[PDB]
Structure 1
Amino acid sequence: KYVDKIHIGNYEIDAWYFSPFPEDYGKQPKLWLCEYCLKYMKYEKSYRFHLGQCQWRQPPGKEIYRKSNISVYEVDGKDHKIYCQNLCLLAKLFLDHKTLYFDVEPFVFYILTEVDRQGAHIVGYFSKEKESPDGNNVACILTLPPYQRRGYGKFLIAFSYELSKLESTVGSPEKPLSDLGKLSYRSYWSWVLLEILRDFRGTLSIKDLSQMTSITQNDIISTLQSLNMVKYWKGQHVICVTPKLVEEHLKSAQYKKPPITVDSVCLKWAPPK
């Protein structure tokens, strides 16, 4: 690690990992980043100059979600390459296993922002491959450290699935997940399944749950395993959901309603092709 601290907007954020900022920018202990267009700089002088020069107050895409002060922007890597590359370099500072930074054309980026009078301030994001061979509805996912543990991570996951639903497709985050990634997804999956298993008056196969939620059969099964809703007969695992098991887990710390939730009506997005 060479760059271990960044200045973005009014935040001083300590870097978690290495990021391959090009040339001599990778060797500087601190970097200054524009909170709107995400360009990186060596010196403070050029930062204080850029504030009164930059022509952006939002990410360079369509506002596809708006409720309250939350807005989500869709940025296509082909149309705004420079922006997404800068985002990916920023993102790598907090992701151990991020592989791509510059080949951004095949990717589409969904930026989470909080909006006020000044503009739309970046909170986090997730990236998504347009054509995924493994059916990955998320590639990397991130909530910037100052905004963490507010529920924004579970919003972004919930958001990625809402896209998948509107695409009539199942999806799963790129593996492997980090420890905080596992906790976030498992928490989200439990909440979704428990809400369905509480209300649904009918027979449910694992297949149905997948179609209802866009969660994969694999992710559903392992979620049900951790909720003690799977029994084992001759090696093979079969679903066993009871009103008692649902009731108990609803009161446990294994059930938690997300502080911030995606409201379907507030989504203003059309699926591609």
Structure 2
Amino acid sequence: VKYVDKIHIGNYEIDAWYFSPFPEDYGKQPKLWLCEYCLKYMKYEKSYRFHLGQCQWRQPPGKEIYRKSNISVYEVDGKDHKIYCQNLCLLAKLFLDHKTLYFDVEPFVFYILTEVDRQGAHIVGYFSKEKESPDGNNVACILTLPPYQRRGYGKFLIAFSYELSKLESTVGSPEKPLSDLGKLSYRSYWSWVLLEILRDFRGTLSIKDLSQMTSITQNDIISTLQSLNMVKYWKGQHVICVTPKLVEEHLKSAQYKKPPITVDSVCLKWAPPK
């Protein structure tokens, strides 16, 4: 009946937050050991140490579609790399309460954020995405591993998901519910993207324009603008406020400034599937 409650991955030891359905025999041990590259989960330090000496993987499988300095993102199709993506989903489930899919990964593509050094590309976080979403979900599950959280990596993944959406010529929204950190990070990302635009744009633009510029839904733009006191309802119309001074102030607060890392669309090499 004992669940996996602690993992070792790369050089990190991390306590679990939630039940993840690793095979029962894996929960029995004190710790679960994961190869930081192929995500294979193991029962013993000895088998982990042996595996590390043998495993040839130094990065996620699939295609490296983004690269800038020591940051890379890999796109991994669930159909082409089933085992990896299963390993990934079981890992993620330790830290996500509401993720319900671990084994049927074929309908998903996964985007793995990594930081890269001489050794290899080290996993920081990911988001999964349904290959077919009539509901307009541009993210299914999103997560940064605990030691990396609240450092700009979550908002990077969020940004990346909208850059894909932009290239798809469509608005997107993450599947609900989000973690508390998820909600907070989306709000801060939207705020930053919008303030940046409202700072620059000289002409007039509506919420409709903003949505098409960012792939953020009108609903999310509106709630974001409302919390920033940058919109009013007048004669049955949402009207954006100008006030360029407030914009500058907002862009300086910790809550809404440019994150420490950002997505350079020039470094994104990706075309939507036809």
Q: Shorter-normalised TM-score: what interval?
A: over 0.9
Please report how far the alpha carbon of residue 22 of structure 1 lies from its aligned counterpart in structure 2 after TM superposition: 1.9
Secondary structure of 1:111 counterpart = strand
Q: Deviations over 1:98-154 (max 9, x none)?
A: 110001000000001111111111111110001012111111111111222221111
CA deviation after TM superposition for structure 1 residue 240, in Å: 3.6
Unaligned runs of 5+ in 1: none
CA RMSD of aligned residues (A): 1.7
CA distance in 2, matches of 1:252, 1:42: 46
Query: Do the aligned partners of 1:72 and 1:110 also contact (CA within 8 Å) in 2?
Result: yes
For 2:130 and 2:117, the matched residues in 1 are separated by: 30
- The 2-side partners of 1:28 and 1:97 are apart by 25
For normalisation by structure 2, the TM-score amounts to 0.94
* 1:222-252, Cα deviation, whole Å (9 max, x unpaired): 1011001232458875444433443443344
Mark the CA change 1:147 to 1:251 in structure 2 (over 3 Å): closer, same or farther: closer
Is the CA contact (8 Å cut-off) linking 1:228 and 1:245 kept in structure 2? no
Could you tell me how far 1:177 is from its partner in structure 2? 1.5
* 1:6 shift after superposition: 0.3
User: What is the CA distance between 1:55 and its match in structure 2?
Assistant: 2.3
Counterpart Cα distance in 2 of 1:52 and 1:24: 24
Distance 1:201 1:239 in 2: 13
Whole-angstrom CA distance in 1 between matches of 2:151 and 2:224: 23
Secondary structure of 1:72's partner?
strand
> Contact 1:137–1:172 at 8 Å: present in 2 too?
yes
Instruction: Report the number of matched residues.
Output: 273
Q: In structure 2, what is the equivalent of residue 105 of structure 1? A: 106
Matched ranges for 1:130-149 at <5 A: 130-149=131-150
- Give the direction of change, closer, same or farther, for the CA distance of 1:203–1:103 in structure 2 (3 Å limit): same
- Tell me whether 105-114 or 244-253 shows the greater mean CA deviation: 244-253
Structure 2: tracts of 5 or more residues without a match: none
Query: Partners of 1:260 and 1:204 in 2: how far apart?
Result: 28
1:41-190 correspondence runs (5 A): 41-190=42-191
* Cα distance change of structure 1 residues 146 and 42 upon mapping to structure 2, 3 Å threshold: same
Structure-2 separation of matches of 1:243 and 1:148? 32
Identity among equivalent positions (%) equals 100
Alpha-carbon contact 1:19-1:26 (below 8 Å) kept: no
CA distance, structure 1, for counterparts of residue 44 and residue 222 of structure 2:
51
The normalised TM-score by structure 1 is: 0.95
